[PDB]
Amino acid sequence: TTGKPNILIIMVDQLNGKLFPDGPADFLHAPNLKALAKRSARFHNNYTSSPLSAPARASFMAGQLPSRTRVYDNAAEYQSSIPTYAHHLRRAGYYTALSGKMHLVGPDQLHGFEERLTTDIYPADFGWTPDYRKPGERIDWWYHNLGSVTGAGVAEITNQMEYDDEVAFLANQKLYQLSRENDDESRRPWCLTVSFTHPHDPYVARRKFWDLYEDCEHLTPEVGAIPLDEQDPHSQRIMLSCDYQNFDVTEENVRRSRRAYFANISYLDEKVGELIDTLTRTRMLDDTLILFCSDHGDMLGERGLWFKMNFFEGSARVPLMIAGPGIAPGLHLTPTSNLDVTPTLADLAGISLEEVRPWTDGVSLVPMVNGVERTEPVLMEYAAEASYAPLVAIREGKWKYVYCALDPEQLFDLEADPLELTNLAENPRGPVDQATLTAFRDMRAAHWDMEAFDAAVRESQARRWVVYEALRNGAYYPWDHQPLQKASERYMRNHMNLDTLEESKRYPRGEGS
Amino acid sequence: GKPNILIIMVDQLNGKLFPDGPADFLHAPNLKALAKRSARFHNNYTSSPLSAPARASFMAGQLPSRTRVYDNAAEYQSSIPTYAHHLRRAGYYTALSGKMHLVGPDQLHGFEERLTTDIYPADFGWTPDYRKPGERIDWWYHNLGSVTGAGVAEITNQMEYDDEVAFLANQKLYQLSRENDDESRRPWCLTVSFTHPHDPYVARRKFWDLYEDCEHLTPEVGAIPLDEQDPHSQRIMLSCDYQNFDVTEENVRRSRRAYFANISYLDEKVGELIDTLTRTRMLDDTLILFCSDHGDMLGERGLWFKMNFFEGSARVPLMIAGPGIAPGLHLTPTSNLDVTPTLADLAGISLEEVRPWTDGVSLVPMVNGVERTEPVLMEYAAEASYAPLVAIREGKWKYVYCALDPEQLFDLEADPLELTNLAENPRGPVDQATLTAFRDMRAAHWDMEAFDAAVRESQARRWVVYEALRNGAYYPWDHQPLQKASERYMRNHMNLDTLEESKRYPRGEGSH
Amino acid sequence: GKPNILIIMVDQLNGKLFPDGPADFLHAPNLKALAKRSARFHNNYTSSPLSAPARASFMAGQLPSRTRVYDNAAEYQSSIPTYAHHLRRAGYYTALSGKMHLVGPDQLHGFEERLTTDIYPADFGWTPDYRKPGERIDWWYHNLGSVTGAGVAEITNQMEYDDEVAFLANQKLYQLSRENDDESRRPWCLTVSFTHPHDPYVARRKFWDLYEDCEHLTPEVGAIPLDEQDPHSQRIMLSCDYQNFDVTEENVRRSRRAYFANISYLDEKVGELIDTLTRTRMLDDTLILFCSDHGDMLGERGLWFKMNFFEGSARVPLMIAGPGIAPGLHLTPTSNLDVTPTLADLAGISLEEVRPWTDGVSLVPMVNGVERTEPVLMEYAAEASYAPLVAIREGKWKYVYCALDPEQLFDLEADPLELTNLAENPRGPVDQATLTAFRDMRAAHWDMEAFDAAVRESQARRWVVYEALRNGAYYPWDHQPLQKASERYMRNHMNLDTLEESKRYPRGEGS
Amino acid sequence: GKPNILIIMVDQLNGKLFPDGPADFLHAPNLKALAKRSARFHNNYTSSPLSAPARASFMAGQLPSRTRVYDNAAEYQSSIPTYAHHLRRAGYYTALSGKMHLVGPDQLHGFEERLTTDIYPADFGWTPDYRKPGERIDWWYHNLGSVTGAGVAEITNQMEYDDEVAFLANQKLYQLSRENDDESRRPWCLTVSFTHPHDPYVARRKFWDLYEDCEHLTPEVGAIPLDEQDPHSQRIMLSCDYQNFDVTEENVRRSRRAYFANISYLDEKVGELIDTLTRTRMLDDTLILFCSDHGDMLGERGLWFKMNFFEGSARVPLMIAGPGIAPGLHLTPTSNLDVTPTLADLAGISLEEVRPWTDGVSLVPMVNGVERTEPVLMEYAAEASYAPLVAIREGKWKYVYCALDPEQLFDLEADPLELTNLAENPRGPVDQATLTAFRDMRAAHWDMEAFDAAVRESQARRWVVYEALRNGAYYPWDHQPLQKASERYMRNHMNLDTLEESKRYPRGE
Ligand SMILES: [Ca+2]
Ligand SMILES: [Ca+2]
Ligand SMILES: [Ca+2]
């Protein structure tokens, strides 16, 4: 029975989850997300499943780990037969739509979404394929580099602001269109994903929002740059992949990058308020669950690192909030995962556990919201640029454990060491630290065959090097999504009942005052 | 110096009808003429007796268990290299006119250009369900209505399709010939993939009239009663709804007659393509390959269509002619799996570049007289199976295994009609040793329990996704050819001083 | 021709729970049935979010600044006319069963008869002091111990009280029906004033079990940290000793579950009253009014109880059914101040008789489709205030002023949970013009310096007087219902022949 | 070590009869012996010439305009502090035997215990109406029938009342004496408030016979005819319905004779209280205050009763005797407004605890030789007024104002009988300057138009309320004294061997 709630998923890109200690941090100018946070169940220790765009987003859609989706990097094909939350909801009777980006690679640019309002900002082809056969070599034309840090600043239009302006406009327009069915008893409930590209770099913001942070006290990272020689091996691979030696990052560069990033959160907050105002005025808010989420974090100069690709807090933590009918507001400290979003959504929509159990590696967060302890650990994977073999991580209780066949292990006690400055795998405090390291090693072997993981990643890369080079010979066939809204069926046309058209398009109906 | 490549593919052509080129009784002058100048692989097999699995496997030179295209509704991943990718990577312009039954949103799988849509769906509709053994889906399963409905018409769904496939292929050849005189041209590879002689068995009168005196309108083995059929054959008859059709001897003769007529319909189209190649002066530089995806039992044993490993269903013709190809008849068993490595080899691509991507072998050494020893493998995991089946063809033997069924072993030299199952009725110790050798070879190649679990998981995925995709507004995956009218023929942004010259070929007396 | 009037009043009922009658999720069949035949005032506000100021203002139809009942220990002058006086003057028998939190020696204030004592004290104990801003008083201030102590019990102080209130109210209706056949009978007005769902949040198991599957056991806005609270909310949070209590999520759920249970408890008593009216054949001649004195935040924003102008605290239900009342839902804001002139109007009293004595307006024109334009006014001047607060509700707007605090402006159609203070954070030019207009409206209704000086003098008087009165033998003011035993039932001075007939009703019937 | 306080209050006693204690011609041996040991305030005034306004003002030490008790039916709010409150706060036991004419449901106003009900109503019955000037309410207004009905009787409504008032007040002193030998005993303050010599002018024959040859049975200023009266006096004459009585010279003499007799009746009762204090050994530790609510014209000028600011109506006696009180006569005008701050001063209460609550001053400084300069203010806003009246008494002067009447100014030294109105015809520039001085002082003290509006609002409220309150079953506010018999005398839950000793006092051989 369709007493089912509507679902508005607001997503943003590259949002460091530590900036949401309990809703947005006090220092951020974000009135609309703070007001949303007060009505929300808030998951303080929520993690991405993979600190990179396409792997995190394919994993997010399916509620499955990259090792199961096979979307290892930003150029890996996402099979159209993999069930996503759009399939699960659509099968249960929802209209499903996406406005904005999801970095799906391959010719399927919908993956269950019934309608998609924008193209993607990023490529949909196999261009950005890493190569495990050439460790230490970087592809300068698509790899991250620190020019974002040295080029931060102020502008009134950017590639990303043109995208997000449009993402927001078409999202609010779709809500307005949906509200015209509000009185139809046979209406399908709806689930709209609004997926913004900010605050992803470039770190460039409109002057109105940049000015908000003139007096900002958080423009210096809380852990300074660690010299290359003192970095752990993965961090060294990242600084090399970012071409760090060819940039002189000053203190001012760091301050301007962080200022523009905070400004772009404030830019998004204005868009969040627009969406909620639309919901309020179309009389749809009380029946609508609102979920706020992100794909991965951004180190923001902490430890001298920028962007993502690692499991340190700033990169792996992303915010997660849920508000609406039946959701108790509150703060939750138990680690949760992006992998839990899809089963959480299925549960909120009234779908049985048995229908989604075969298709997800996460757990519904609804029992948490209703006072049931969650015990499952949080699992993460990374297998893209700046790795030479896959890395996996486990987050459970107060611990984070990181393994890569090529590197010394890492173990962090986040209650005693929230900034992850003391590796206990190498400097154990006592026998408990050693017993803990042993138990995580066994957990690691219970979840991953790291040799098979490496081999599968190498085969996936190898396929695409053959295929992508072929596809770039001769005439190119693009896979980018092209939204179509048929002009011949919109607004007023002479095959329609014109004395009924205006009433159909009007909502609310029959009112004055 | 790289040759052009024309691939002529037909659908559902029983390979037993090409004993040495087309059988004598077929009216097929153009294919018999092409055969005389071809290397002919008399004992060539499909890799899977079903359209999409055979075609995905044909395109990749990989077995269905590797492509994952188990049935007619299984997604074919776009990251899987095909002979299109391999040729295109080597510098070929590649194009497809006709069908390939690709399932999923990629309708090119490496082809640079595709001139027609597919005749069949590109979505997950036709998914079998191993969880419901014994039922059928009436709205897409085969049924014997094609046998009782055979006859004569001047247009059909398939004749509209194939008429269009032919026109656009000859037009593309004409278009390509305009680049003949430019030394920096790319060589081209054009696949022309017709839907005939696949059923419905309905032919144009012109071609139905050619077989009025035909002496092959009776199958060579008669209908085997259901109680005497091996279990898989029983499953095929149930899936075809055999009990609700009263197939008469006249139904059988008419179906076979129209089927032979449609081969002659195709033969005319082969002559058109050869004629285009001749008059455009590209024939001498063009390799010509003739192939099919699977066969058709055509009433033999009482069976119709495909879905099994018997000769009529699993045999398909294969020939290659052109520059550097010595003609002759080859008898060692070969596979559609070999087509992709054979193409790459003919195009000068190194064996090492294709080795990691193909389970077949190049046939070019065979064309040049080299003995072959590699066996021929086949798989089936779609409708009328309740669990996967596999077959091995080696020397004179064929072995067929399904976990649920008695094994089958045939000696095709002593028993070309596979009337004696030597697994059940061995002639002596050598047949017993042979069975054991094939058992061991099967176990080293397939884990049939892992195979069955992979097929089940693939079916279950699609049951969830397809039901969702059929809710709300449908988003189609069918390929839409686009030829930009604003850039064709005469337009006022173009150099009209040079347009006519560039579109004229050959450029003889009067041309610039 | 004058109709009977039954006023059903409950205590601390959050008006947001009555969007259109009781909300669907409440188990309240009797109040849902009453609502369906009622004029229902969706946006009805208390005039002061505290028990005694709200109740004295309700009785008089006058704001606290006029009644002088500023807090829960402020004397209510017996010379102030109430709806009981107005009706009694027009020929009504008037009676109260239940509480009214009247402070001072007059415990009737016009009621001709009162069937129970009060549940609360009648003296000057609970007196605030503006000369000591920042202190709290633990032996009478609200504290969060009600939240941590919520649960289930088969008797409580409040359930003993309300069981008696209900029994005597139904008994009185039965007594009154014996005069139905007399043409010269006075019409009656009976006020039944229950103490639930006021805390303690403790309910009978039977009603507790109704809400096991409830989806509203948590509030729509969570606890806002002290540092982010507006200053009045901060004063309140200190006032309930919020830091001395560890309020778990389960405490929140148990508290709201028992509160909902006690509404269902009340719903059963509403049905008994209606059933008595039905069987005595007085239903068709009786106006029924359902009301409350103030709301309860119930954990929203982290706040419990009242003392503020936020919706959960200031909104209270108001419903009217009966002869001459067209049913319907009304969204224009209305006020408890309006009940007294509404009642007098329904009783045939002229507007001129009541105009000099009321700050509200009759709602009868609303019921009959006539637009109401007067704003809704509210005041607070008790504990957790350091100076009086006033509020104005008009159109979609709510404006709150206190001379010690930043102003608050809410657009309730855009922001029904009041999460954006538009005085600090206007959305545009119209928010600003609207702020200026409310400031002008405020200066037109209130002299805030005179308000504060009158509150301070009243507090100081009582501090001198109460100290004295708690020395020596105490003289209590609690109402004691009259004793009539020698004139009740069968006594040998009466006529034992007509006695049974007089006490019987209906009379001379069979079937 | 705080003293006991006995307040003896009488009703309607003309203060001019106490020129230095009681006048010689009165038979009042006990009040004269008391006067001799008393500080005596010869020129003491009521704050309002009417029962309930005077008594509410007496208790609060606040003017009627501040108490809001404007007339004999105006509610007295229980939140207004009274001298009972102040003394109770300071550790005193406080009690009242007799009348106080408190209107409203509070019949204690801080008294811890009250031994009798009131002789007068406690409800809003006697409410005037400024909207109907010139009319009168015959069922409770004063009328001259008291003057024509004067005589002799052995029991009256008032003698029954005052006999019981006296008996319960002496019993209470006995009960209090049992606590004498207890160190932790609270000090006590007992107010004994008699209804005499208020009219009816009817006395017991014993006391009536004491004035056979009395030489003061003729008023010192005869009747003034209506058309020669000041307009307020005219309003009073109509309110008493004067033209419906033939008041003879005999009626005047009879009324004044019965009035003087009832002073003697009261004097006997004062002797009883004093004797009870003496024999219980509480006397030396007890302050004794003698006072009255308002006066009585007693025929002077042809007027009777009160309601005006003339000397006979506005003067009331005031005396204080006891520990720490130097005897002597004081001539500076004082006011009933001063009793409450005087009591609080005598009880050791600091001046700051009481100053925000009183419009009067402590008289203890005068008793001890400190000159007092504050003026004496009075107000009247009840029957026979159509708008409020105020008066200022300072030095030798009395100024009387009502917006609707000509002003009155009197020099009481040159003109003790108030026969020459210096506002209408002054003696010279000094008189004129004086009138101007008072006009300005009055304007600084009262807005008379705000006064009139508050009186009207109070009347209007009560007209709505009192009508309702008199429909249906009536709920009375009259005080019912408490007396648990189950806890009195000898009961079988107490220690009987111990009961007799604790109820016995003094406790010697
Ligand atoms: Ca991204
Ligand atoms: Ca096919
Ligand atoms: Ca209350």
Separation CA D333–CA D337 (nearest Å): 12
Phi and psi torsions of C357, nearest 5°:
-115, 5
Separation CA D53–CA B499 (nearest Å): 122
Instruction: Write out the two tokens for C380.
Output: 């607070």
Instruction: Write out the two tokens for B22.
Output: 């087309």
Q: Cβ of A114 and B473 within 8 Å?
A: yes
Residue of D nearest to C111 (CA): D469
Q: Cβ of A466 and B78 within 8 Å?
A: no
How far, in Å, are B163, C302, C380 from residue C297 at the CA level? 78, 8, 16
CB-based contact B39:B321 (threshold 8 Å): yes
Interface test with C, best of D68, D464, D467 (most C CBs within 10 A): D464
Instruction: Write out the two tokens for D69.
Output: 């008790």
For residue A373, give how far its alpha carbon lies from the nearest alpha carbon of chain B (Å).
31
Separation CA A364–CA A361 (nearest Å): 10
Query: Whose structure tokens read 């399908």?
Result: A188
Cα-to-centroid distance, C197 and ligand 3 (Å): 9
- SS3 call for A12: strand
Sheet of D376-380, strand order: D376-380, D389-394, D397-402, D408-411
Q: Is residue A378 part of a domain?
A: yes
CB-based contact D82:D56 (threshold 8 Å): no
Q: Cβ of C464 and D81 within 8 Å?
A: yes
CB-based contact D376:D46 (threshold 8 Å): no
How far, in Å, are C69, D44, D316 from residue D65 at the CA level? 21, 20, 20
Helix boundaries (H) for D77-180: 83-89, 145-148, 157-177
Interface test with B, best of A4, A71, A72, A81 (most B CBs within 10 A): A81
Contacts of A28 (CB under 8 A, 6+ apart): A19, A262, A265, A266, A269
Q: Cβ of A80 and B458 within 8 Å?
A: no
Residue of C nearest to D464 (CA): C81
Cα-to-centroid distance, B207 and ligand 2 (Å): 22
CB-based contact C287:C321 (threshold 8 Å): yes
Residues in chain D within 8 Å Cβ distance of C94: 472
Instruction: Write out the two tokens for D103.
Output: 């209107």
Determination technique used: X-ray
Residue of A nearest to C218 (CA): A328
Q: Which ligand does the CA of B58 lie closest to?
A: 2
Helix (H) or strand (E) holding D259, with range, is helix D249-279
Residue A507, amino acid: Y
Instruction: Write out the two tokens for D472.
Output: 């249906």
Question: Nearest 5°: CA angle at C28, between C26 and C34?
Answer: 130
Residue A76: half-sphere exposure toward Cβ, Cα within 13 Å: 29
Query: Whose structure tokens read 């009626």?
Result: D251
Tell how strand A391-396 and strand A378-382 pair up: antiparallel
Question: Nearest 5°: CA angle at A64, between A58 and A69?
Answer: 55
Residue of D nearest to C124 (CA): D79
Separation CA A9–CA A322 (nearest Å): 9
- SS3 call for B263: helix
How far, in Å, are B144, D211, D216, D249 from residue D204 at the CA level? 140, 12, 19, 22
Mark out chain A residues that contact chain B at CB-CB < 8 A: 77, 79-83, 86-88, 90-91, 93, 95-96, 106-108, 110, 112, 114-115, 126, 188, 358-359, 460, 462-464, 466-467, 469-471, 473-475, 477
Residue D449, amino acid: E
Separation CA C194–CA C199 (nearest Å): 12
Separation CA A169–CA B315 (nearest Å): 59
Q: Is residue B512 part of a domain?
A: no
Strand partners, D398: D393, D410
Separation CA A198–CA A210 (nearest Å): 14
Query: DSSP letters along C397-452, please?
Result: EEEEEETTS--EEEETTT-TT----TTTS-SSHHHHHHHHHHHHHHHHH--HHHHH
Q: Is residue B366 part of a domain?
A: yes
Helix (H) or strand (E) holding D44, with range, is strand D44-45
Residue D402: half-sphere exposure toward Cβ, Cα within 13 Å: 20
Q: Cβ of C219 and A329 within 8 Å?
A: yes
> Which among A325, A326, A329 is the nearest to C222, CB-wise?
A329
Separation CA D370–CA D367 (nearest Å): 7
Separation CA D204–CA D153 (nearest Å): 5
- The answer, yes or no, to whether B and A have at least 3 beta-carbon pairs within 8 Å is yes
Task: List chains touching A (3+ CB pairs under 8 A).
Answer: B, C
Q: Cβ of B468 and A87 within 8 Å?
A: yes
Contacts of B188 (CB under 8 A, 6+ apart): B4, B5, B92, B93, B94, B95, B176
Q: Which burial class, exposed, middle or buried, applies to C245 when counting CB atoms under 10 A from its CB (0-12, 13-18, 19+)?
A: middle
CB-based contact D77:C75 (threshold 8 Å): yes
Q: Is residue D364 part of a domain?
A: yes
Separation CA C280–CA C415 (nearest Å): 47
Q: Is residue A512 part of a domain?
A: no
Separation CA C391–CA C47 (nearest Å): 9
- SS3 call for B390: strand
Helix boundaries (H) for B280-356: 311-314, 339-346, 351-354
Mark out chain C residues that contact chain A at CB-CB < 8 A: 215, 217-222, 224, 249-250, 301, 413-414, 417, 419-420, 425
Separation CA D41–CA D334 (nearest Å): 7
For residue C327, give how far its alpha carbon lies from the nearest alpha carbon of chain D (Å).
32
Residues in chain C within 8 Å Cβ distance of D84: 468
Q: Cβ of A96 and B472 within 8 Å?
A: yes
Q: Cβ of A112 and B469 within 8 Å?
A: yes
Phi and psi torsions of B100, nearest 5°:
-150, 0
> Which among A39, A277, A326 is the nearest to C221, CB-wise?
A39
Separation CA D445–CA D377 (nearest Å): 9
End-to-end, the C-alpha distance of chain D in Å comes to: 27
Phi and psi torsions of D335, nearest 5°:
-140, 150
Instruction: Write out the two tokens for A226.
Output: 């660690």
Q: Cβ of C218 and A329 within 8 Å?
A: yes
Instruction: Write out the two tokens for C45.
Output: 């506000």
Residue D282, amino acid: M
CB-based contact C257:C214 (threshold 8 Å): yes
List % helix, strand, coil for chain C (3-state, nearest 5): 35, 15, 50
CB-based contact D230:D406 (threshold 8 Å): yes
Separation CA B104–CA B462 (nearest Å): 11
Give resolution, Å, one decimal.
2.1
For residue C425, give how far its alpha carbon lies from the nearest alpha carbon of chain A (Å).
10
Tell how strand B286-292 and strand B4-11 pair up: parallel
Cα-to-centroid distance, D49 and ligand 2 (Å): 123
Q: Cβ of B462 and A110 within 8 Å?
A: no
Q: Which residues surround ligand 2, an ion (CB under 5 A)?
A: B 11, 51
- Compute CA A237 distance to the chain's CA centroid, rounded to the nearest angstrom: 23
Tell how strand B408-411 and strand B397-402 pair up: antiparallel
Query: DSSP letters along D301-357, please?
Result: GG--S-SS-SHHHHB--EEEESTT---EEE-S-EEGGGHHHHHHHHTT--HHHHGGG
Instruction: Write out the two tokens for C355.
Output: 């105009």
Dihedral in degrees, nearest 10, Cα atoms D400, D402, D404, D410: 0
For residue B354, give how far its alpha carbon lies from the nearest alpha carbon of chain A (Å).
10
Q: Which ligand does the CA of B382 lie closest to?
A: 2
Sign of the dihedral through C-alpha D323, D325, D328, D334:
negative
Own/partner long-range contacts of D15-18 (Cβ < 8 Å, ≥24 apart):
D15/D44, D15/D45, D15/D292, D15/D295, D15/D311, D15/D314, D15/D315, D15/D316, D15/D317, D15/D318, D16/D295, D16/D311, D16/D312, D16/D315, D17/D263, D17/D317, D18/D42, D18/D317, D18/D319
CB-based contact A65:A59 (threshold 8 Å): yes
- SS3 call for A391: strand
Please list, residue by residue across D163-199, b when 16 or more beta carbons sit within 10 angstroms of its beta carbon and e when fewer do.
ebbbebbbebbeebbbbeeeeeebbbbbbbbbbbbbb
Q: Which ligand does the CA of C306 lie closest to?
A: 3
Instruction: Write out the two tokens for C101.
Output: 């939190």
* Cis ω for the linkage preceding B197 (within 30 of 0): yes
Separation CA A413–CA A420 (nearest Å): 8
| Residue B488: count of CB within 10 angstroms of its CB | 8
Cα-to-centroid distance, A294 and ligand 1 (Å): 9
Residue of D nearest to C470 (CA): D89
CB-based contact C393:C415 (threshold 8 Å): no
CB-based contact C232:C308 (threshold 8 Å): yes
Q: Is residue C246 part of a domain?
A: yes
Separation CA C162–CA C150 (nearest Å): 18
Helix axes D51-60 and D339-346, enclosed angle (nearest 10): 30
Q: Cβ of A39 and C417 within 8 Å?
A: yes
Query: What 3 state SS string does A350-389 have?
Result: CCCHHHHHHHCCCCCCHHHHCCCCCCCCEEEEECCCCCCC
Task: List chains touching D (3+ CB pairs under 8 A).
Answer: C
> CATH code at B469?
3.40.720.10
| Residue A183: count of CB within 10 angstroms of its CB | 12
Q: Length of chain A, please?
A: 513
Tell how strand C93-98 and strand C334-335 pair up: unpaired
Separation CA A161–CA A197 (nearest Å): 8
Interface test with C, best of A22, A26, A34, A38 (most C CBs within 10 A): A38
Separation CA C372–CA C361 (nearest Å): 9
**Domain extent at residue A187:** 6-505
> Which among C218, C222, C249 is the nearest to A38, CB-wise?
C222
Domain count of the fold of chain C: 1
Question: Nearest 5°: CA angle at C258, between C254 and C262?
Answer: 170
Cα-to-centroid distance, C192 and ligand 3 (Å): 14
Interface test with B, best of A96, A464, A466 (most B CBs within 10 A): A466
Nearest residue to B460 via CA among A376, A20, A355: A355
Separation CA A58–CA A49 (nearest Å): 10
Own/partner long-range contacts of B23-27 (Cβ < 8 Å, ≥24 apart):
B23/B216, B25/B214, B25/B215, B25/B216, B26/B260, B26/B263, B26/B264, B26/B267, B27/B207, B27/B210, B27/B211, B27/B260, B27/B264, B27/B267
Instruction: Write out the two tokens for A160.
Output: 């990303």
Nearest residue to C234 via CA among C301, C287, C183: C301
Residues in chain C within 8 Å Cβ distance of A325: 215
Nearest residue to B376 via CA among B12, B51, B45: B45
Separation CA C43–CA A386 (nearest Å): 61
Q: Is residue D509 part of a domain?
A: no
For residue A300, give how far its alpha carbon lies from the nearest alpha carbon of chain B (Å).
35
CB-based contact C293:C58 (threshold 8 Å): yes
Strand partners, B197: B11
Q: Is residue A491 part of a domain?
A: yes
Phi and psi torsions of B142, nearest 5°:
-50, 150
CB-based contact B360:B346 (threshold 8 Å): no
Tell how strand D376-380 and strand D334-335 pair up: unpaired
Mark out chain D residues that contact chain C at CB-CB < 8 A: 75, 77-81, 84-86, 88-89, 91, 93-94, 104-106, 108, 110, 112-113, 124, 186, 356-357, 458, 460-462, 464-465, 467-469, 471-473, 475
Q: Which ligand does the CA of B197 lie closest to?
A: 2
Phi and psi torsions of D486, nearest 5°:
-60, -15
Separation CA C126–CA C135 (nearest Å): 13
Question: Nearest 5°: CA angle at D283, between D277 and D286?
Answer: 110
| Residue A144: count of CB within 10 angstroms of its CB | 18
Q: Which ligand does the CA of C58 lie closest to?
A: 3
CB-based contact C44:C318 (threshold 8 Å): yes
DSSP code at position C301: G
Tell how strand B151-152 and strand D4-10 pair up: unpaired
CB-based contact D46:D336 (threshold 8 Å): yes
CB-based contact C297:C305 (threshold 8 Å): yes
Q: Which ligand does the CA of B292 lie closest to?
A: 2
Separation CA D9–CA D6 (nearest Å): 10
Query: Whose structure tokens read 């009840």?
Result: D382
Q: Which burial class, exposed, middle or buried, applies to D454 when counting CB atoms under 10 A from its CB (0-12, 13-18, 19+)?
A: middle
